[model samples]
Target: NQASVVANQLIPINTALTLVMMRSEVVTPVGIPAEDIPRLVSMQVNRAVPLGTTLMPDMVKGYAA
Candidate 1:
């Protein structure tokens, strides 16, 4: 298997991480109106996470062990 992450990373248990969108990752609620960005902050918060690797729903939901 090939994972870009050759080294493990830690996503803290409690954090409002500002996810940097890559070329592939998806953000939902599309086909709607929009608003201003960055003047304050972009990307809307999605949901709370489990304590481990970022469980980016529907995509990577397996446990780290």
Candidate 2:
């Protein structure tokens, strides 16, 4: 059922384009303020796709031990 549902679904490329355009608008001249733009963009981007908390144990152990 899930496979059939997925197969029947039509993902629009326009959706991705809309998202990109929205992000660009926010970072561009009209959307975000010039002085705070960098910090705001960085904060927003970091919030959207946060860094992973999972550490590489082997790498840590190799360096520490």
Candidate 3:
């Protein structure tokens, strides 16, 4: 799926239609999992990375929380 625009400020919604998913850098196109969900969240764009933006065993500890 493609992504829509991210509001630079706070906004409200009547429906979930405006919600979208943004992608993160991936290697070689492998299957993804549930833990990857936070690349962005359309409900609260503040909860996401800034419009655009990973990792290894050393970085695994961060997400391990």
Candidate 4:
């Protein structure tokens, strides 16, 4: 099963994403995508994500083409 990447800490808006992996019984609909991993490091996060929140693509900006 594919693990979902979750926020390891409180992520405020306009900050970089801090992530950790979590196993789930089912697929996480909003989990971070494998293709986005390389770019996510430098992208500014667009929303406030609580610890354990699934990191989704829409939460990041400025890295996409």
Candidate 5:
């Protein structure tokens, strides 16, 4: 028996700005392990390295909770 695999891309958008990129996978429901079910349909998140705006010192301090 053989299985088919599907792939897709996920992108984050904020107004006119594009943030991150994600990759997703979908597999056919044939001879699949129960434990590996979650892994099959998962997202790979890639955060934006060079952000448009810098976080202020006060914002960072507030996030330290």
Candidate 6:
């Protein structure tokens, strides 16, 4: 049920990551790691993300803290 994010969508800056769906090879069925959500909020997608694709640190830019 953790899946809420729009799979394979081009997310803009400050996009709501708390709303994503699905998971990738590096990710579990729950989707992006729980802790990554906070950090992801401060950053934007670096590239076009696809369904079941795990979000990496470098994949996004900037940071809130």
Best by lDDT: 4
lDDT of 3 by residue, 1-65 (tens): 32223323233332121324333344432333334455323223212333322122122223332
Q: Which portions of model 2 show Cα errors greater than 4 Å?
A: 1-29, 45-65
> Which residue pairs in candidate 2 collide?
none
Question: What TM-score would every model get versus the actual structure?
Answer: 0.20, 0.18, 0.20, 0.60, 0.18, 0.45
The window of 10 residues in a row where model 6 has the poorest summed lDDT is 21-30
**Whole-model lDDT, model 3:** 0.30
Runs in model 5 lying further than 4 Å from the true structure: 8-37, 45-65
For residues 1-65, could you state the per-residue lDDT of candidate 2 as single tens digits? 11100011222322211222222212111322223222222112211221221111121222121
lDDT of 5: 0.26
Which pairs of residues have clashing backbones in candidate 4? none
- On residues 1-65, what C-alpha lDDT tens digit does candidate 5 reach at each position? 44322222222322112212212233444222223323433222233213222211222222221
lDDT of 4 at 24: 28
Q: Which portions of model 4 miss their true places by more than 4 Å? A: 18-27, 34-38, 63-65
* Tens-digit lDDT track of model 6 for 1-65: 34322344544444545444322233443434545554465345666665556665555565322
Q: Where does candidate 6 clash, by residue pair?
A: 4-19, 4-20, 5-19, 5-20, 5-21
Global lDDT of each candidate: 0.26, 0.20, 0.30, 0.55, 0.26, 0.47
Candidates by lDDT, descending order = 4, 6, 3, 5, 1, 2
